[PDB]
Amino acid sequence: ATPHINAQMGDFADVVLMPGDPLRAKYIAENFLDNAVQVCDVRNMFGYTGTYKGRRISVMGHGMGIPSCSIYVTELIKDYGVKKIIRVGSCGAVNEGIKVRDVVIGMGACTDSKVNRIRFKDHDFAAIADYKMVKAAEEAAKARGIDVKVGNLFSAELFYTPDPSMFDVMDKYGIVGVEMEAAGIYGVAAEYGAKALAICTVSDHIKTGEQTTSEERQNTFNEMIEIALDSVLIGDQ
Template identity: 45%
Template sequence: MTPHINAKPGQIAKTVLMPGDPLRAKFIAEKFLTNVELVNTVRNVFMYTGLYKGKPITVAASGMGVPSIGIYSYELFKFYDVDRIVRIGSAGAYTADLKLYDVVLVNEAYTDSHAYAEMVLGQKTHVLRPSAKLNAQLLENALKLGIDVTVGRIHTQDVFYSSRPLEKTIEISKAIAVEMESFALFANAKKLGKEAACLLTISDNLITHEETSSEERETKFSQMMEIALELA
């Protein structure tokens, strides 16, 4: 056990899906898994292990932001011997072409600050990439399920309420959408020789100002969930 996870050895599966919201983790476990066990309750960051189509998988909340997912993904990789983590989260679109509920598969994560990469990897980089192998598997899963996926660069932003003009942020990041966690997940995977990927559902559009409700973000992002669950 770690300071942040009280699961016992063997209670975490080799494949972990990480939504940000603990209640989304609970929803996924109850809706899609069988033989479900709640294996972590520290700080109410719920983690569940169960079976999907007879195969073990863990759904673990990450909390919000780089520091939070940085802690949980590192501990899962390092101390629970997890092989691969897929973040399944929400994102705000930087382009009018992305509609509410569209699914995005991340092929690059850009961050404004190189601090996390410098501290974890010892390098000053603003861009990190997921596992190419894992991305290929997720694309194959989406194809089999008949779900359209947009592949692109996302912006992992540390500041939610930024005063920088949106147009400037989009110009700098060259991203199609924004979220707050993927860069740290990719850094930890690279550091520890593990696999990581990120699937996102568009929850709001910063260009058109369309948005979903908190309840919809918790329960209605099922396509992204189904693509990731097929990795079990």
């Protein structure tokens, strides 16, 4: 009943996992959730609701970029009663302390977008995740024997950046991964009084160009999804 989501109140759980690709949302629903049913498909932005260890959880794509994910997250919170959003994505690393296949958590998200300046009187709004969600994801990873790197993501406006020198600045300031949405999701969560978190797997190294096999990448993605879902159960305690 919203312009970008053809669902009804109650169709989504109060916690929604969101990759950018709607086909990754389909993959998560089919392989990690039990009895997941599709709840939306406007603009092919697929969303599903099923259970994980008996707990109701939804998964839906958010598209690429701050403006796209802002629309979906805003509607989920204000029109569907969603309380927590976990972006589950991929990112490029810029620092030598971070390696391909690492799992990173954006406790903060830097950005070159103007959206938070539009909201915050042109001052610096520190786009941050919800602390308890970060803690739950780090504890879930520790229980699985995975060491997550917690720090700042960089949410880029231009994937094909006209300023590649900025990657060196990100490296110097310890950015853990480059993606295009966390700062926008965090801005919406603060504006609408909800909670969010962005967890990402490092799929490529922007500075080194390091590569891996498709199998290795899929394995890391799977590990990250399990951590996100386990974190929901820890968060419920």
